């Protein structure tokens, strides 16, 4: 499957793509404002994610740091990124269908649209100004809007037991972005697409 990753933000981002235990394609790349990077993701990939990273520095060997979404200091991510990270999430070719969503469970850094480029389903978007409107207690001094699990490490925010409800913090993310997951047990906003669809992830779509 192809994923065209497009940076419509006015600032550079470093895109990242991983399934947690391995890179997808090269795993990451710099995207200046307006640049597009097309990756290939193996069919059957389960639990893949794409995200933006901001305010990064890398040496010539591809080692460094980002202020949001850093994946072990690598340009080419092999693992998931450090919150806050708006997440484009997907599982491909799962019994004949693909499944896509956007999640704010690991916080929010950059607005994104995640849409098919092929027929048969709709896209999802979280493009509101979550960082600007972020509750004081969730603001990440490094940049972005943290989720409450990250900040407070409770059973209720992290849904550790599997019994949790919505919270005043999850409801903030849900208000700003109804079509993204706001906590682990949120009413799903997953879209079913045809198996082997292709996609575009756009940072700062609006």
Curated annotation (Swiss-Prot):
SMART domains referenced in this protein's UniProt entry, alphabetically: THN
Source organism, top-level taxon: Eukaryota
Location relative to the cell: Cytoplasmic vesicle
Disulfide bond keyword on record: yes
Disulfide bonding pattern of the chain: 9-204, 56-66, 71-77, 121-193, 126-177, 134-145, 149-158, 159-164
Major site of localization recorded for this protein: cytoplasm
Keywords: Cytoplasmic vesicle, Disulfide bond, Signal, Taste-modifying protein
Pfam families assigned: Thaumatin (PF00314)
A cellular component term, taken from the record's GO annotations: cytoplasmic vesicle
InterPro entries in the record: Osmotin/thaumatin-like_sf, Thaumatin, Thaumatin_CS
Homology family: Belongs to the thaumatin family.
Role this protein plays: Taste-modifying protein; intensely sweet-tasting. It is 100000 times sweeter than sucrose on a molar basis.
PANTHER family the record matches: OS03G0233200 PROTEIN (PTHR31048)
The protein's name in its UniProt record: Thaumatin I
Origin species: Thaumatococcus daniellii (Katemfe)
